[PDB]
Amino acid sequence: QIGLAQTQ
């Protein structure tokens, strides 16, 4: 289980 969230 991997959750990856990115914002710029």
Side-chain angles (χ1 to χ4, degrees):
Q1 183 176 254
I2 298 172
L4 200 173
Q6 300 175 306
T7 192
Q8 65 194 14

